[PDB]
Amino acid sequence: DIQLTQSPDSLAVSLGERATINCKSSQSVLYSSINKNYLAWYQQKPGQPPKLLIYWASTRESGVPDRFSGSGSGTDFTLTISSLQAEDVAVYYCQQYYSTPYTFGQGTKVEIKRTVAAPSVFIFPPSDEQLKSGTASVVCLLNNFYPREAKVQWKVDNALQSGNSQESVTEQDSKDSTYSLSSTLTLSKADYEKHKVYACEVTHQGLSSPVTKSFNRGE
Amino acid sequence: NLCPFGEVFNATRFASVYAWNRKRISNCVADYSVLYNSASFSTFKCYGVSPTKLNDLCFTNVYADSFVIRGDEVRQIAPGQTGKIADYNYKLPDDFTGCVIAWNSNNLDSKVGGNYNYLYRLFRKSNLKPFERDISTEIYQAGSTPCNGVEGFNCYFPLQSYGFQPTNGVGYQPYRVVVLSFELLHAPATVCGPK
Amino acid sequence: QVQLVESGGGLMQAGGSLRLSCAVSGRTFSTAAMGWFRQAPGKEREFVAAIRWSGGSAYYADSVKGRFTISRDKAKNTVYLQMNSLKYEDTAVYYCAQTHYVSYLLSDYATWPYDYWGQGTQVTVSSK
Amino acid sequence: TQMQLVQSGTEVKKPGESLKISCKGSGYGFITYWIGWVRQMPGKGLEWMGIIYPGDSETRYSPSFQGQVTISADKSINTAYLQWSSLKASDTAIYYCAGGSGISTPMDVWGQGTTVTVASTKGPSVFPLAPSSGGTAALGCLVKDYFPEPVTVSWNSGALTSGVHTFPAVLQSSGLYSLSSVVTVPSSSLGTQTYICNVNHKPSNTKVDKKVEPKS
Numbered sequence: 001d002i003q004l005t006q007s008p009d010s011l012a013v014s015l016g017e018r019a020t021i022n023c024k025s026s027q028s029v030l031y032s033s034i035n036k037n038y039l040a041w042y043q044q045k046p047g048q049p050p051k052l053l054i055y056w057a058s059t060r061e062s063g064v065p066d067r068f069s070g071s072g073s074g075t076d077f078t079l080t081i082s083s084l085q086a087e088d089v090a091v092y093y094c095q096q097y098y099s100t101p102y103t104f105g106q107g108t109k110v111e112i113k114r115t116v117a118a119p120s121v122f123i124f125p126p127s128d129e130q131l132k133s134g135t136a137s138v139v140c141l142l143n144n145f146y147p148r149e150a151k152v153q154w155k156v157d158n159a160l161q162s163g164n165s166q167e168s169v170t171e172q173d174s175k176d177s178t179y180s181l182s183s184t185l186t187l188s189k190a191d192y193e194k195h196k197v198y199a200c201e202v203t204h205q206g207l208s209s210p211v212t213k214s215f216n217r218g219e
Numbered sequence: 220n221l222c223p224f225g226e227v228f229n230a231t232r233f234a235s236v237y238a239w240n241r242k243r244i245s246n247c248v249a250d251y252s253v254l255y256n257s258a259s260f261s262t263f264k265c266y267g268v269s270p271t272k273l274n275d276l277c278f279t280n281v282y283a284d285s286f287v288i289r290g291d292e293v294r295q296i297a298p299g300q301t302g303k304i305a306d307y308n309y310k311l312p313d314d315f316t317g318c319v320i321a322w323n324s325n326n327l328d329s330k331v332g333g334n335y336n337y338l339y340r341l342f343r344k345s346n347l348k349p350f351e352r353d354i355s356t357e358i359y360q361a362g363s364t365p366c367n368g369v370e371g372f373n374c375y376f377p378l379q380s381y382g383f384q385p386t387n388g389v390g391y392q393p394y395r396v397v398v399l400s401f402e403l404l405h406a407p408a409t410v411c412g413p414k
Numbered sequence: 415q416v417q418l419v420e421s422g423g424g425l426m427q428a429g430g431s432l433r434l435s436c437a438v439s440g441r442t443f444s445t446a447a448m449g450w451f452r453q454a455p456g457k458e459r460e461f462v463a464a465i466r467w468s469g470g471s472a473y474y475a476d477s478v479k480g481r482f483t484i485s486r487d488k489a490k491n492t493v494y495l496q497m498n499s500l501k502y503e504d505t506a507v508y509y510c511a512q513t514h515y516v517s518y519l520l521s522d523y524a525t526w527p528y529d530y531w532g533q534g535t536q537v538t539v540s541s542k
Numbered sequence: 543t544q545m546q547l548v549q550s551g552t553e554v555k556k557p558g559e560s561l562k563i564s565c566k567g568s569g570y571g572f573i574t575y576w577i578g579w580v581r582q583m584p585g586k587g588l589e590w591m592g593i594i595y596p597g598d599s600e601t602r603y604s605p606s607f608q609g610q611v612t613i614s615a616d617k618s619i620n621t622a623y624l625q626w627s628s629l630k631a632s633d634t635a636i637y638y639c640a641g642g643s644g645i646s647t648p649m650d651v652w653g654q655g656t657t658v659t660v661a662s663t664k665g666p667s668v669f670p671l672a673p674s675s676g677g678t679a680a681l682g683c684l685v686k687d688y689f690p691e692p693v694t695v696s697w698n699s700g701a702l703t704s705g706v707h708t709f710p711a712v713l714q715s716s717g718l719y720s721l722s723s724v725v726t727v728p729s730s731s732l733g734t735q736t737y738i739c740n741v742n743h744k745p746s747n748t749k750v751d752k753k754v755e756p757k758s
Contacts, residue, residue: 033402049655052648124684126669141682141722170709263574265643266645271545271650356468368469370466379517
């Protein structure tokens, strides 16, 4: 049984630059019949089927742009995208077909590298309709920033709180190459009315000092 | 300079499986689509190569191996199979790269009261090497006494007739088989798709 | 198709020897085995001897075993029946037969219905 | 095109039920093709399940799925099947059928995939995130406590595509999904034009429209 591991796991490269992706296999995938390596390269965008780009390690598939190029022999292979573009941002899987069972790599994300952009932070106190469910959610939103790397801490009543917050990040905007994050703190209505000041503190590489955005309960 | 695959698949005469026929294909354009878009074949198994991509691939030599066997034995024409055909008549290597194409030939190769012209090797001391062709007719020692070219109890003729009749169960009807092997050496690649 | 023409029949004394031939013409490449049969007047046609064309391995009915020899020259496409120690009970018309059927078991040519048949050659064995 | 594969509709099943999804090959030359099944769970990789040659239904399973699924094929309708006997919660994922005209061949044809989800459905509760003051302000909808995905949200039915971010749902400890949908508009327009989010959750067939606006 062959196993494939790609390096790196994730990858950010600016427009116009080159990304390369390693894929090393447990055992060699060379047919001797025809001096060809049995390894291939798949691109998958969110909400799309995998697309074949490269087969026989190095042969391009129909309707695949020139800049995509596969190489390697034996155990180590690479897929190099010269001149990265907008519409290249996706996950890249290597796959062998030397033998069944067929096996894939873990996959590799590629995204656009960009000048740092500080997030614009806003805080939403809980709905008044939501407070009739018996539940209260405070959400903090970091809007149009790069990189994604960013720490958001909740401070309910000037006390740091842990692990009753959850985050979600948009995939990179196609046009400004930015992310947006939402840190959502949930607690019950009962616990909600035990505290008065709710604050959201953001440290990001684009901010010289942590930006806090707070509110007092029902003001 | 079209490849004479017509000569191979549409042939009037097919070889006995034990004495299987090999055509070496070179110096021609191969339109593979004429095979795979055909409705005529019942088995079309390809190992290590895809018929749809051959149309823009060049090879140094393509080998067409043709013979008759019964339906039940078509599944033995595969790498890593065992049985009479695989072991004693025609042997694919484990790492085979090529296509296994077969069709029911009951309309041609059966006749009422049986067609017995088609043979196979029933006995042999040892398995065939891959793509070996054995046309020996030495008497086979099945018991503990040496035969020295005389048939007897436990001393048999190594070959036997298939019995092809039109009423036969599909398992026992005649199938024509072609095996395509692909060769890519450091020499002029003379066997090319139309593109 | 093949044509079978036998020769060598005639009058012979009991204890003597006599050799029949069968010459094969036409699609001779097909020959897997040849057989000799005989028919005594008004009695059943009876299997005598068979020879596999390859190797020349022979099978005989018990009635002639130890007396008769079947042999063949491949180049000449001719099979022979050597009838040694001729007996009164050998008096009959002798027929050669040809099949392109290959069985691994030589004894099956004793029961197999063959493909083509000769015209028959009369052997008459004289007393004592 | 030589060959395209079409897959069965998306399936809303509950633990213990069985399921047999399909993948029908459309084209001449189907006899050459081997159909493969690939499993990809939300956020995770591709997992190769098995492959079948419908010619004689020769199938191979990956050790990860031998005895846990069965792969049939009906050659007479160019269809391959992936069947369970009892769906586990484990089994919620998208399933791709993938074709290559051979064994040891790249899979050059991929169906749209079929998403199977193994749990009871619940409609989303929609809560507004009203703005406050300045330059240009943000506002949004909280779509909370629902199963399963997706939920869609548009703003004034699509009269607002400018400055919209709908967040990837995060499954809570609740075992229900939640996400926020926000949009940024000039502080000018907050008191002139009204902004209404239109949320569709098709698995519970509930479509909710909450208007957002500032309160005292």
